[PDB]
């Protein structure tokens, strides 16, 4: 027998455990409290919440599956988040370290906001490195597994120990090549070289050996028959996977010889101009399976996307069977198994093919459209 002089009924307040590091205090909020207000009361009742400027801190609901933890939006109210008495929010630092592979082999570490999408972080990353054309850029895990620009790193399963790659994804505008800025020249070189080498830029066997000849001149200096003889080369470092044939060593060394005493800068300039001169340059290819009239077996075929068109290309000859301008495409739709283009009245029938790349294809087509729309308003 003992009543409680402190008993208060009809209290309709969220009783939440606030977590900051080793510390866990319990605090009371009115459910309709804006999140930016909850952070404010946290800062006024727990001194460990003053360890950094407010803009660096947020409320975070954790989860056994890290991809499912969420940062609460400043503009919402606690009850939007179906909070029940006894739940924990962490008042948590928003900045995480992120490792991007640098051109000199080092890895720069950039602080990025764990609460923002990959689109937003790309501005941060390019500014900290000094890239101007950031809407042409994207990220891949070091390990063409492009990440999703409309989702955070956390919700795609990218862990903080992972090192990421900054690569050019869209080919909308090309600055001129200038031997007077060797740093910029080396960028354009490294970008064209990696695309040839990894197979993003398909090239003939003959051409793949000509690039390799330039790459030899750039990495070893003028050809030296004494040191650059049979067996010298690690072909996987100099040829696309498709191109690796020991017939190539002799062919690469010839091209290397034909450079004579070309300087490393002239070789880089000649490498970039050659790549830019191929009709494959700036085209993203995807492997799809078409259906022919009659033929119940599907034909493998390449789908090429550019800043101007979508293209049906032959898997071997690389010649363009058919090309549709992006302005002739009314809508598209992807599935985990298919990709489909609607052309409106420009054609009788949809274009539909099997591919595991439907979503990647759609993201490329939509990204080019978004660059085009952004460039049309900014020229008005």
Curated annotation (Swiss-Prot):
It comes from the Eukaryota. It is found in: Cell projection, Ruffle membrane; Cytoplasm, Cytoskeleton; Cell surface; Cell junction, Focal adhesion. Residues 96-376 form the FERM domain. Residues 253-380 are annotated as: Interaction with LAYN. The modification Phosphoserine is found at residue 378. High molecular weight cytoskeletal protein concentrated at regions of cell-matrix and cell-cell contacts. Involved in connections of major cytoskeletal structures to the plasma membrane. With KANK1 co-organize the assembly of cortical microtubule stabilizing complexes (CMSCs) positioned to control microtubule-actin crosstalk at focal adhesions (FAs) rims. Part of a complex composed of THSD1, PTK2/FAK1, TLN1 and VCL. Interacts with THSD1; this promotes interaction with PTK2/FAK1 and VCL. Interacts with NRAP and LAYN. Interacts with SYNM. Interacts with ITGB1; the interaction is prevented by competitive binding of ITGB1BP1. Binds with high affinity to VCL and with low affinity to integrins. Interacts with APBB1IP; this inhibits VCL binding. Interacts with PTK2/FAK1. Interacts with PIP5K1C. Interacts with F-actin. Interacts with SVEP1. Consists of an N-terminal FERM domain linked via a short unstructured region to a large flexible C-terminal rod which contains 13 amphipathic helical bundles (R1-R13). The rod begins with a five-helix bundle (R1) followed by three four-helix bundles (R2-R4). These are followed by a series of eight five-helix bundles (R5-R7 and R9-R13) in which the N- and C-termini are positioned at opposite ends of the bundle, creating a linear chain. The four-helix bundle R8 does not disrupt the chain because it is inserted into a loop in the R7 five-helix bundle. This is Talin-1. It comes from Mus musculus (Mouse).
